[PDB]
Amino acid sequence: GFTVLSTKSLFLGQKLQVVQADIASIDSDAVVHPTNTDFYIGGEVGNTLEKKGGKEFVEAVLELRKKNGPLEVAGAAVSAGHGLPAKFVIHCNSPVWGADKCEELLEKTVKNCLALADDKKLKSIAFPSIGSGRNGFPKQTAAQLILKAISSYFVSTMSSSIKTVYFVLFDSESIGIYVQEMAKLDA
């Protein structure tokens, strides 16, 4: 299942929503997959995507690694969401906490995801908690940078097709954080 916990309707038309769900089951047009520069599949998200999409999901990622080569820090790249409810999967390589411009790099990362979804005229994108796992970002900092990036992007990209963004979270503390942070946005 998939239940909406909290919604922030932005002034420029976009719905931001917080959900608890297996991100792999989200009916969304795109799903974000935090990876490293070699399209490694693990972590929370790597493993559920694989759990859901099996060989197909994995074949597409491998194909994508051949074509794309290494993913720069902040870079994203798309694979087709074969064997997943999602139509596309956007792989991104977030910066590591403590690196210079780690914060700036993370805003870039989020914008790259969004630009790629707009690049394919996608109308929704599901973000998991980017950065805050193994990339070591505090949950408050990650949440604030992400939501700032997203707000910046939309006010700065009028041609954007994206109408809904999901923040998919498994734990209560993270949910409470996103909920508070979204609520601070109007712009």
Side-chain angles (χ1 to χ4, degrees):
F2 155 172
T3 309
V4 174
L5 301 188
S6 172
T7 305
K8 159 47 59 175
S9 282
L10 291 182
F11 294 164
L12 263 64
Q14 301 88 346
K15 276 205 280 99
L16 269 47
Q17 300 192 135
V18 172
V19 184
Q20 243 220 20
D22 172 5
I23 189 171
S25 47
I26 304 306
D27 194 347
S28 86
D29 280 2
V31 168
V32 177
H33 174 236
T35 12
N36 70 352
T37 82
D38 264 305
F39 297 89
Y40 176 82
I41 302 159
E44 327 234 313
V45 175
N47 277 344
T48 25
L49 289 174
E50 194 172 336
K51 193 184 284 229
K52 202 56 142 287
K55 278 171 163 176
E56 287 160 64
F57 167 70
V58 171
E59 246 148 357
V61 173
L62 258 40
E63 265 150 29
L64 171 59
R65 204 219 283 192
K66 281 201 198 205
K67 162 198 157 272
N68 195 273
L71 203 54
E72 3 75 75
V73 169
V78 198
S79 67
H82 291 320
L84 301 169
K87 290 174 190 171
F88 297 93
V89 175
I90 294 164
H91 308 266
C92 68
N93 173 17
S94 110
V96 174
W97 182 232
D100 310 58
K101 326 197 178 159
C102 50
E103 41 258 326
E104 299 174 27
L105 287 176
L106 220 210
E107 290 185 41
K108 255 98 148 204
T109 303
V110 173
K111 280 163 183 200
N112 284 356
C113 293
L114 298 159
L116 247 38
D118 272 313
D119 221 316
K120 302 203 136 41
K121 315 180 188 190
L122 305 185
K123 38 229 130 60
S124 55
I125 188 162
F127 275 93
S129 190
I130 299 178
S132 30
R134 82 176 56 191
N135 289 242
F137 274 86
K139 302 198 209 169
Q140 172 62 243
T141 312
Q144 272 165 358
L145 289 176
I146 291 161
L147 292 161
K148 183 190 177 290
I150 288 171
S151 164
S152 167
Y153 181 88
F154 284 127
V155 79
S156 301
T157 309
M158 244 49 68
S159 40
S160 193
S161 72
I162 297 153
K163 247 77 262 290
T164 299
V165 358
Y166 293 110
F167 298 110
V168 192
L169 305 155
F170 328 118
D171 82 283
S172 300
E173 183 190 36
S174 308
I175 288 150
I177 290 173
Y178 276 80
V179 160
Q180 291 183 115
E181 291 309 88
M182 280 208 300
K184 293 176 163 170
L185 288 171
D186 266 310

